[PDB]
Ligand binder design. Structure first.
Ligand SMILES: OC[C@H]1O[C@@H](O[C@H]2[C@H](O)[C@@H](O)[C@H](O[C@H]3[C@H](O)[C@@H](O)[C@H](O[C@H]4[C@H](O)[C@@H](O)[C@H](O)O[C@@H]4CO)O[C@@H]3CO)O[C@@H]2CO)[C@H](O)[C@@H](O)[C@@H]1O
Ligand SMILES: *[C@@H]1O[C@H](CO)[C@@H](O)[C@H](O)[C@H]1NC(C)=O
Ligand SMILES: [Cl-]
Ligand SMILES: [Cu+2]
Length: 235
């Protein structure tokens, strides 16, 4: 159970973005229905007044929270992967538009799921802004908690993979446009009950056998990472 407070740009806090540059839902309840319009940008998808200015090669850091900013972030039972997608604000989420810029599941060395590391990072994970056409974009961050993903929602409505999904409005000002944005996948639509990574037993199966949902990460991505970049408590 978790939501996004706002973003930092190159380590600089852009202030509370809720309902201002983030399309925030009314609360932190998960999304579970794979076919629902809520898979796009959660239950409350609508243009909000503002958009964060960035340039290609900026580091955009999303800050998640549970109840208050910089609290325990997400419950420690909610093991799973984290992903970030981009689409043009043009689409409004609809059609085959979403492109993956980041995926992180289980790191075998430290033996931590991406969600564990996000808790350590005080709710902060980042992506480098790719060299797409200047303009207005939605960045959709998704945490998949798998603590009940042994069943499917469509067969057992009280269980299933849980998606904590949030969309940020971002304006990309300076960019050479060396990597124009391709078409990508629809949400709802890219995740179905058959798709790998959706049904999985984190209690019986080992985390190394986990295989995150498709699609794979666009080659035009410049990466990202899970790690604190600023301190919220100095504010
Ligand atoms: O851990 C192994 C076990 O997990 C079982 O699932 C548990 C979760 O482990 C547990 O974390 C979860 O807790 C939820 C709780 O159900 C919600 O009601 C609560 O919602 C709050 C929210 O936290 C607040 O921010 C908001 O303001 O109010 C709402 C409503 O009160 O959120 C917590 C997590 O933060 O409960 C699950 C039970 O369904 C699995 O079922 C089991 O298979 C695993 O073995
Ligand atoms: C899931 O969402 C779809 C599309 O809106 C809806 O029609 C369907 O009834 C929902 N499923 C359940 C189990 O509520
Ligand atoms: Cl839960
Ligand atoms: Cu939860």
């Amino acid at each position: 159970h978790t939501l996004v407070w706002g973003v930092w740009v190159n380590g600089v806090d852009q202030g509370d973005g809720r309902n201002i540059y983030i399309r925030s839902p009314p609360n932190n309840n998960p999304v579970k229905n794979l076919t629902s319009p809520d898979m796009t940008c959660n239950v409350d998808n609508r243009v909000v007044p503002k958009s964060v200015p960035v340039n290609a090669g900026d580091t955009l850091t999303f800050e998640w929270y549970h109840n208050t900013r910089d609290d325990d972030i997400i419950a420690s039972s909610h093991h799973g992967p984290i992903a970030v997608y981009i689409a043009p604000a043009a689409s409004n989420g609809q059609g085959n538009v979403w492109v993956k810029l980041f995926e992180d599941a289980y790191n075998v060395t430290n033996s931590t799921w991406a969600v564990d590391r996000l808790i350590t990072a005080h709710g902060q994970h980042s992506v480098v802004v790719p060299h797409v056409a200047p303009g207005d974009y939605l960045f959709r961050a998704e945490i998949i908690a798998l603590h009940e993903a042994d069943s499917l929602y469509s067969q057992n409505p009280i269980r299933g993979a849980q998606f904590y999904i949030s969309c940020a409005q971002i304006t990309i000002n300076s960019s050479d446009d060396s990597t124009p944005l391709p078409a990508g996948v629809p949400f709802p639509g890219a995740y179905t009950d058959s798709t790998p990574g959706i049904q999985f037993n984190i209690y019986t199966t080992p985390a190394t056998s986990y295989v995150a949902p498709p699609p794979s990460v666009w080659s035009g991505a410049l990466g990202g990472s899970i790690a604190q970049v600023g301190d919220a408590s100095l504010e």
